[PDB]
Amino acid sequence: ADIYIPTLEEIKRTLQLAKDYSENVYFIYRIALESGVRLSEILKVLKEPERDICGNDVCYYPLSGVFYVFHITPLKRVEVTKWAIADFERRHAIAIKYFRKFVASKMAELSVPLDIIDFIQGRKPVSLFGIAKEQYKKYAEWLKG
């Protein structure tokens, strides 16, 4: 009951298409799928990947209250520009900007409260970060399977 939310299959396909095209581009879509965070925040983060923190289950990157880019696979230094992603899309797939709609949607299926989904995804609308990480862990589990 929501139009622009991709399906797992369409996402699965875009990932593969990106993997065949480039390892750098594939890595960006991968993080987009793990985080639910804007493309711009992803690129800002991959230029300083040494600030990434990885726990046993999930990883997280502190931005700048404060937001975190939650993800699963450790960051490596990637130099893609918005331009090179845009190029990729033009040749094909799901637009990366719709990846966060999917992510927010699965998180809601996994019973993550909307205020927490907003926090995970970077929008302003025990501790705060602790609860968010435990919630994020549900999406991380689902994602690996």
From Swiss-Prot:
The active site is at 38, 100. It comes from the Viruses. Residues 1-140 form the Tyr recombinase domain. This protein may encode a site-specific integrase, which is necessary for integration of the phage by site-specific recombination into a tRNA gene of the host chromosome. Essential for virus infection. Belongs to the 'phage' integrase family. This is Integrase. It comes from Sulfolobus spindle-shape virus 1. The chain holds residues 174 to 334 of 335 of the full protein.
